[PDB]
Structure 1
Amino acid sequence: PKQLRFEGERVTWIQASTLKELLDLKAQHPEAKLVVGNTEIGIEMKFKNQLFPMIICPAWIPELNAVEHGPEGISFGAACALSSVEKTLLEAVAKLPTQKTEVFRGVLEQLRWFAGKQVKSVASLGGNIITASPISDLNPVFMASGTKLTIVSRGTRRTVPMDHTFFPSYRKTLLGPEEILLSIEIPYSREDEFFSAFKQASRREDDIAKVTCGMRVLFQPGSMQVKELALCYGGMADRTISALKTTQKQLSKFWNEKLLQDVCAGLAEELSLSPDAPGGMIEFRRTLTLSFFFKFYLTVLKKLG
C-alpha cells in the first residue's frame, strides 16, 4: 500500500498510505483538505462552489480506522464509517450491562433516523465531528458525555474531552491548522450515570434551526442528588452549545418537580431566541428544548427508581 497522487483540472489529490505521510502532508500543507466519505466536501464543492486544490485521503491509514476496547470506553479511528460505529455499539449494547452502555445507547439513537444505509457506510465519524455543523446530531452527544478526542499533528499528540470550547465559532473547531483528529473514544457509562438523546423530527434549513441534543446526568451514590449535569444542544445557535449556566444551578440538587421547572426556566432564558433568529420556528424551537429535557427528566426518574 504505497502513497498515490492524482492530478486533475483544478485539484490535486493524495492517497496517504501512512500516518507519517499524513502528518507530513498536513504539516507541509495546512490548508489541504482531508476527505474520507466526501458526504460533506462533495456538497461544499457542488452546491457551495468551493475549490480546494489540495486534498488528502487517509482512509487507508491503520489508526483512524482502529477499534479498541478499553477500560474507559470503546475507541474508533476518526475515519471509521458510522455504520461501523453503529455495529460495534450494537454488540456492546447486547453484551455489556445496561448501566455501562448508556452513552452508547444515545449515539445509536441519533444514528437511527439518520440519512440512510448509503450515507452511514461512507460517512466517517471524524468527518461528522470536524464539519462542526450547527445541526450535527452527534456532537451534542459527544459533548454532553465529554467524549475523548485524541488529536494529532506530526510530532505533537494530545487527548481531551469534547466541550463547549471545542467549537469556537460557526464551522470552526479547536483543531490546529496542521492538526488532524486521529481517534475518538465513546465513554462507558458509570453507575448513577444516565444518558438521553433526542432530535427534531424535521429539517427545513441547510444547517441551522433543527433542535438536536445530548443529555447526561450523574447522581451521588445511592441518592437522588445531582453530582454532574450536561445539557448540550444543536440547532439552537451557529454551533453546538451547552446550557452550562443552567446545569450548574442544579449540582448537588435533588431530582424532583422543583428541579424540572428550575431547569426549564433556565433553558427558556439561557437558550433564548430573538424574533429575528436565523432559521425561524422560534416558538417551536424553544418548546423542543424544554420538551426534550422533560423527557430526559421523566426517563431519569424511571432509571432512578
Structure 2
Amino acid sequence: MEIAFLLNGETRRVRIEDPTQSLLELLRAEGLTGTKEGCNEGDCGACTVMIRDAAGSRAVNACLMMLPQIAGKALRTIEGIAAPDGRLHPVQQAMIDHHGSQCGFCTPGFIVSMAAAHDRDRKDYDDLLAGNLCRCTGYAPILRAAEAAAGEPPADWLQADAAFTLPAFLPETSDALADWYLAHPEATLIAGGTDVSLWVTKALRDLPEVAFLSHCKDLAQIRETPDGYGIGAGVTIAALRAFAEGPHPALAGLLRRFASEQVRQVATIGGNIANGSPIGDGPPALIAMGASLTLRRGQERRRMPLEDFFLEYRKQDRRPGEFVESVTLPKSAPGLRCYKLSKRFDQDISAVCGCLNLTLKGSKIETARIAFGGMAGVPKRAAAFEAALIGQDFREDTIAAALPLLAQDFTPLSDMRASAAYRMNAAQAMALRYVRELSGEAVAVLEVMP
C-alpha cells in the first residue's frame, strides 16, 4: 500500500509494508535525525513534529503516530523549520537570543511546538508547551523566547504547505467502516493511537488486522441536535475541548489537563471511551453530566447511558464487530464541575477524578449526578452517596455528614500514584469542594495570582 505526503516542502510517496511503524522511526531511519526520541511513550515531546491539512496545522508527537496516519498531510520536522534560504524562524533566533537551550536535546521539540504555535498565533504557552519536558533550564528562558518571537510575522514558507494535495484498512466513511469491522471482528481499530502505540513500543506487541479511523470525516463531526449535541467517536479531545468552551466550560476546564496539546490534538473521545480505563478522564465527566453513548454494528445501533457501558475492570458492553460511534451531550449542565487530582498538574494521570453535578430546587437538592474515575475497576456513579443526598438541604454540613457513604460506594486501590487512604479521603474532599465552590468561596489553587 502506497501513501503520499509533503515532507518539509517536498512531495513524498512511500510503500507502507508495516503499517504499524511509528512516524518517529521512519524519520530517523531516513536520517532525519533531528527529531529526538526521549521516551517513546507520549510524555516528553522531544519528538514533536508539525502536521497540517485542511483543519489547519498542529503539533503532535511523532512517537505515537503511525505512518498511515499522515496520508495526504503536510509534515514539517525540525530540520525544515528554517526557510530554504537558510534564514532562521523567529522562534529559533528567539531561543538563541534568550538562551532557551542548554543541553540541546529537548530543543527541536520545543521549536517545533513553538513554531506550530506561532503559525496559528496561539499564545497559551503553559498549556501549549506542557508536553515538552526540559530537565535543563527551568523553562523561564523558554517563555521569554516564545514571547519575544510572537511579535514577528509568521513564516511565509511554512504557510505554503497549505496548498497541498489540491496491508491495513483505511475507511473513509462510517459505513465502510461498519461493513468491514463486521467481517473482521477481531481486528485492531486505531484512532488516535495514543493508547495503542504503547502496545507496540513498550509491550513490544505486534498487531495484524488493523484499521485506521482518522480518515472518516463523518465519524468526527460535531452535530447540534434537538436535544443536545452529537459527538462522533473520532472527535479529537482538543476539538472536544474547543467546542466545550462554550456550553460546557467545566468540561473544557477538565480537558485542559487531559494529557498535553500534543496528545489532545489526535487523541479521540471515542478512543478514550473504547479504551475503557478506570482512569480515563472523559467518562467521569460525561457520566456526571449524564450523556449517552451510541454503539454500532453494521446498520444496527444500540444506545445506553454512558456509565452503563462499563461492566468490569477491563471489560465492556461491546459486541463482536460492535464499535463506538458517538456520544450525546445535553445542551446544558451548569451543575457540572470537574476535579482532577494528580501528582503534578499538567500532563499527569488522575489519582482520582471527581465529577460533580447537582440540580437544585432552591436550597433543596433535586438531582445528584456524581461520578468518579480511578476509585474502582471502572468509572461509576457513587449511588449510596447520591442517594443519601436527594432532598436534603444544600449546605456544607449535610454533605459533611454523608461523606462516609463514599467508603461504601468505593474501596479504592493503593499504588505508585497515591495510597487508598488518600484516594478515599480525596474523593470525600472533592465533595466539600463542590459545596464550597458553588457557595462562591475561593477554592482552586490554580487561580491564585501572585
TM band (smaller chain): 0.7 to 0.9
Q: Which residue of 2 aligns with 1:83?
A: 238
Residue type of the partner of 1:231?
A: I
* CA spacing shift, 1:250–1:36, aligned 2, 3 Å: same
TM-score by length of 2: 0.57
In structure 1, runs of 5+ residues without a counterpart are 94-100
Encode CA deviations 1:238-262: one digit per residue, 9 max, x unaligned. 2212211210122222212342123
Encode CA deviations 1:254-297: one digit per residue, 9 max, x unaligned. 212342123312113432347xx455512321121011111112
Q: Which residue of 2 aligns with 1:167?
A: 310
Alpha-carbon shift at residue 123 of structure 1 (Å) = 0.5
Alpha-carbon shift at residue 208 of structure 1 (Å) = 8.2
Q: Which residue of 2 aligns with 1:199?
A: 340
Alpha-carbon shift at residue 141 of structure 1 (Å) = 0.4
Q: Does 1:31 align with 2:175?
A: no
Alpha-carbon shift at residue 153 of structure 1 (Å) = 1.0
The DSSP-based 3-state class of the residue aligned with 1:111 is helix
Which aligned pairs between 1:1-305 and structure 2 lie closer than 5 A? Answer: 7-8=17-18, 12-90=167-245, 93=246, 101=247, 104-163=248-307, 165-190=308-333, 194-202=335-343, 210-220=351-361, 223-273=362-412, 277=414, 281-302=419-440
The DSSP-based 3-state class of the residue aligned with 1:168 is strand
Encode CA deviations 1:132-177: one digit per residue, 9 max, x unaligned. 11211111101112212122110201332212x3111123222222
Moved over 3 A (4+): 5-12, 277-280
Using the alignment, how far apart are the partners of 1:42 and 1:232 within structure 2? Answer: 29
* CA spacing shift, 1:249–1:240, aligned 2, 3 Å: same
Count the aligned residue pairs.
279
Using the alignment, how far apart are the partners of 1:167 and 1:299 within structure 2? Answer: 30
Alpha-carbon shift at residue 29 of structure 1 (Å) = 0.9
* CA spacing shift, 1:228–1:9, aligned 2, 3 Å: closer
Using the alignment, how far apart are the partners of 2:317 and 2:329 within structure 1? Answer: 19
Larger-Rg structure: 2
Conserved 8 A contact 1:148-1:187:
no
The DSSP-based 3-state class of the residue aligned with 2:259 is coil
Which one scores higher on RCO, CA 8 angstroms, separation ≥ 6?
Answer: 1
Using the alignment, how far apart are the partners of 1:62 and 1:219 within structure 2? Answer: 40
Name the stretch that deviates more: 114-123 or 257-266.
257-266
Name the stretch that deviates more: 134-143 or 43-52.
43-52
Using the alignment, how far apart are the partners of 1:209 and 1:151 within structure 2? Answer: 26
Q: Percent identity?
A: 24
The DSSP-based 3-state class of the residue aligned with 1:287 is helix
Using the alignment, how far apart are the partners of 1:188 and 1:263 within structure 2? Answer: 30
* CA spacing shift, 1:158–1:6, aligned 2, 3 Å: farther
Alpha-carbon shift at residue 225 of structure 1 (Å) = 1.6
Using the alignment, how far apart are the partners of 1:225 and 1:186 within structure 2? Answer: 25
The DSSP-based 3-state class of the residue aligned with 1:217 is strand
TM-score by length of 1: 0.83
* CA spacing shift, 1:54–1:225, aligned 2, 3 Å: same
Residue type of the partner of 2:227?
A: E
Using the alignment, how far apart are the partners of 1:259 and 1:88 within structure 2? Answer: 35
Using the alignment, how far apart are the partners of 1:212 and 1:144 within structure 2? Answer: 11
In structure 2, runs of 5+ residues without a counterpart are 1-14, 22-166, 442-450
Q: Which residue of 1 aligns with 2:40?
A: none
The DSSP-based 3-state class of the residue aligned with 1:160 is coil
Using the alignment, how far apart are the partners of 1:260 and 1:210 within structure 2? Answer: 22
Alpha-carbon shift at residue 89 of structure 1 (Å) = 1.9
* CA spacing shift, 1:296–1:224, aligned 2, 3 Å: same
Conserved 8 A contact 2:170-2:211:
yes
Q: Which residue of 2 aligns with 1:98?
A: none
Conserved 8 A contact 1:208-1:238:
no
Alpha-carbon shift at residue 299 of structure 1 (Å) = 2.0
